[PDB]
Write a protein that binds this ligand. Structure first.
Ligand SMILES: O=C(NCCCCNC(=O)[C@H](CCCCNC(=O)c1cccc(O)c1O)NC(=O)c1cccc(O)c1O)c1cccc(O)c1O
Ligand SMILES: [Fe+3]
Length: 697
């Protein structure tokens, strides 16, 4: 379940540490993985997503059965690098997952665009030779009522209909209540003036509806043809969250209301063929995401708060089209080896009405940008060709080179080579090394010169004068040279391993630091504002350690541990951190199979210290509560699963047994009337009992 670079989570693991609702909860406990924001602002800080090796969650590519999820790219990408999005790990329900694969660093680059951190691939349970199904229910109960409880019901149902014809379907209904609007009261950062009384929000709630159907059709013994369609819906429950933690009356009106809904529809055709020379796979996916939410402002403090002048919903639409071909070729030659050949094509169409609406009446107008009625539409296509060769130099030693070439229709050509070595120093010991250069295509917001934010001063780098920030079709893609060197002892369920990783991070895209221009005209002190773009930041670095250790204490009894230690995370231009992660993270499970029918689990997670950014949006050094750090802390849990028959199991447990709690105080830095909160940007939920029930044939 842990090799160097790679982790599997199984369906059995999902049962022994049941997630509330989102899978991020269990995915984040792998080595190398954190749950964090994309950037340092702390904005939308209770909306944290899976991060691989400190590279940010935009560089974690989420797959379902090998097919991209791109839905979050429908949510506005803000000045400071965040989206008001819960991410893309909540589309498949926990209890219909067969396994999750997490692939980190150099072994992930070959997957291409947006895998600089790595790939997380959520794999669903499939039909068997007979009809099976299941019914899974989960329900939790926080000690403190402020905190939102979660409820989850999902079925699955699968089998043959003819000898050439099979199916699987599932459907899920779930709800995570929001935190009370006031859960952070008395923990909030200092707030004066007109910002007096405002609150850093707790966790947003979500309602889920997921329905998938799959038909697998065996055209020949060697040819399989699959069709599936997916329908999901998430609607939130709002609890006061605003980009800057300021409030108005529209915010309060909606408290408890659904203010955003994502409908996600996937249709896919997949043909899979296994024959003399080897294997073929090819697929078409159409993902259509509709992101309906309340119109928000786009200027300064008003960025990311509901806009009262223009009340009501807009709908942003993402149409994402993915097609993929491979075959593979066993090749007997100088070295016995295996070769893989493939193209990939994608199209991202984005229609977003609210995002390109900022006007130029106050900061003065911008040559080449119309102040009104700018386009909704943005798009990019990448075409890609690749080949991997997997090579047995001598038994138990493997070499895997591959080349990916990608043509982005705007950005141009990218070349992402890779090379992955494993060696058995001993029948017990294995050394692994990898060095790849991964690829990140600028997202459609960064790329678009119709996308325009404005600030009167407070958000402008290197000045207090008003400024604009503008998209930039000139940009280069972000690339990263992800190096990793690791060693693992592995014998009779004793596993002990330690990996060092460094990713050299080139052209990270980010709000720029110097004006490229100045507008002309507009009003008063704010006239002739500065113009900044999205830049490529020349160099950044992340660096750290991953470890695993697994000891069989006796037959009934297994002690497992995963360790992340983050050495460095540095924008080498500004010297500030890229993300806020914990210095280290240790997850420890004890697994007692107390009887053939009772399993018991104890867990602990230790989080290290967390430090905020050094510099504000001006580039100046922060002060007061902006500096505040989060001390190390641990979260422990007990649970069990009691099997009542082959057809019926029960679970129960406690998460956060000693009620260690944390509270979102605000964003990192201070603005006028709103003191910063440093690293205290999220809510850690308290003691929480849970129960569960799984019936299956
Ligand atoms: O005095 C300023 N703005 C006008 C005061 C009335 C606005 N008061 C508000 O409560 C609201 C919300 C203020 C909440 C605190 N501000 C922030 O957290 C903030 C964050 C990032 C960037 C900013 O410019 C911010 O103000 N501001 C606006 O209506 C506003 C409109 C257009 C352009 C802006 O930059 C805005 O902030 C000002 C002066 C220098 C620098 C600024 O960023 C200012 O907003
Ligand atoms: Fe402002």
């Amino acid at each position: 379940k842990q090799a160097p670079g790679v982790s599997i989570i199984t369906a059995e693991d999902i049962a022994k540490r049941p997630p509330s609702n989102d899978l991020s909860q269990i995915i984040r406990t792998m080595p190398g993985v954190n749950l964090t924001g994309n950037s340092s602002s702390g904005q939308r800080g209770n909306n944290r997503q899976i991060d691989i090796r400190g590279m940010g969650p935009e560089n974690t590519l989420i797959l379902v059965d090998g097919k991209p999820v791109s839905s979050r790219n429908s949510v506005r990408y803000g000045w400071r690098g965040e989206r008001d999005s819960r991410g893309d790990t909540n589309w498949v329900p926990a209890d219909q997952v067969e396994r999750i694969e997490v692939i980190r660093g150099p072994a992930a680059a070959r997957y291409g665009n947006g895998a600089a951190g790595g790939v997380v691939n959520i794999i669903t349970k499939q039909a068997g030779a007979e009809t099976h199904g299941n019914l899974s229910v989960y329900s939790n109960f926080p000690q403190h009522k402020a905190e939102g409880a979660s409820e989850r019901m999902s079925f699955g149902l699968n089998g043959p209909l003819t000898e050439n014809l099979s199916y699987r379907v599932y459907g899920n209904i779930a709800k995570t209540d929001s935190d009370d609007w006031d859960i952070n009261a008395g923990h909030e950062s200092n707030r004066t003036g007109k910002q007096a009384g405002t609150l850093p929000a707790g966790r947003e709630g979500v309602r889920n509806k997921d329905i998938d159907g799959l038909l697998s059709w065996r055209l020949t013994p060697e040819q399989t043809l699959e069709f599936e369609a997916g329908f999901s819906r998430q609607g939130n429950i709002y609890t006061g969250d605003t980009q800057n933690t300021n409030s108005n009356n529209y915010v309060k009106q909606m408290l408890g209301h659904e203010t955003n809904r994502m409908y996600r529809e996937t249709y896919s055709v997949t043909h899979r063929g296994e024959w003399d020379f080897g294997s073929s796979l090819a697929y078409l996916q159409y993902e259509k995401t509709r992101n309906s939410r309340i119109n928000e402002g786009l200027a300064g403090g008003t960025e990311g708060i509901f806009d009262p002048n223009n009340a009501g919903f807009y709908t942003a639409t993402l149409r994402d089209l993915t097609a993929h071909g491979e075959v593979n070729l066993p090749l007997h030659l100088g070295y016995e080896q295996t070769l893989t050949l493939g193209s990939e094509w994608t199209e991202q169409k984005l229609d977003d009405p609210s995002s390109n609406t900022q006007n130029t009446e106050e900061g003065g107008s911008i040559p080449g940008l119309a102040g009104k009625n700018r386009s909704s539409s943005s798009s990019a296509r990448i075409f890609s060709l690749f080949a991997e060769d997997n090579i047995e130099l001598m038994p138990g030693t493997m070499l895997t080179p591959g080349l990916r070439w990608d043509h982005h229709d705007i950005v141009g050509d990218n070349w992402s080579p890779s090379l992955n070595l494993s060696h058995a120093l001993t029948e017990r010991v294995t050394l692994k090394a990898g060095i790849a250069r991964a690829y990140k295509a600028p997202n459609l917001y960064q790329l678009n010169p119709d996308y325009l934010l404005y600030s009167r001063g407070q958000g402008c780098y290197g000045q207090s004068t008003s400024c604009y920030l503008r998209g930039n079709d000139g940009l280069k893609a972000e690339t990263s040279v992800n190096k990793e060197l690791g060693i693992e002892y592995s014998h009779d369920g004793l596993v002990a391993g330690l990996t060092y990783f460094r990713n050299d991070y080139k052209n990270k895209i980010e709000s720029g630091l110097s004006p490229v221009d100045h507008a002309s005209g507009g009003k008063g002190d704010y006239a002739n504002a500065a113009i900044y773009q999205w830049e490529n930041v020349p160099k950044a670095v992340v660096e750290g350690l991953e470890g695993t250790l697994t000891l069989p204490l006796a037959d009934g009894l297994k002690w497992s541990n995963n360790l992340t230690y983050m050495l460095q995370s540095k924008n080498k231009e500004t010297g500030d951190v890229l993300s806020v992660t914990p210095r280290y993270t240790l997850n420890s499970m004890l697994d007692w199979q107390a009887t053939d029918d009772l399993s018991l689990q104890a867990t602990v997670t230790w989080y290290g210290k967390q430090k905020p950014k050094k510099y504000d949006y001006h580039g100046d050094r922060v002060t007061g509560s902006a500096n505040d750090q989060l001390s190390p802390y641990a979260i422990a849990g007990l649970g069990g699963t009691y099997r009542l028959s082959k057809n019926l199991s029960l679970g129960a447990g406690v998460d956060n047994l000693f009620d260690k709690r944390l509270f979102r105080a605000g964003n990192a830095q201070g603005v006028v009337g709103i003191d910063g909160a440093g690293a205290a940007t999220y809510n850690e939920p308290g003691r929480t009992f849970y129960t569960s029930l799984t019936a299956s044939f």
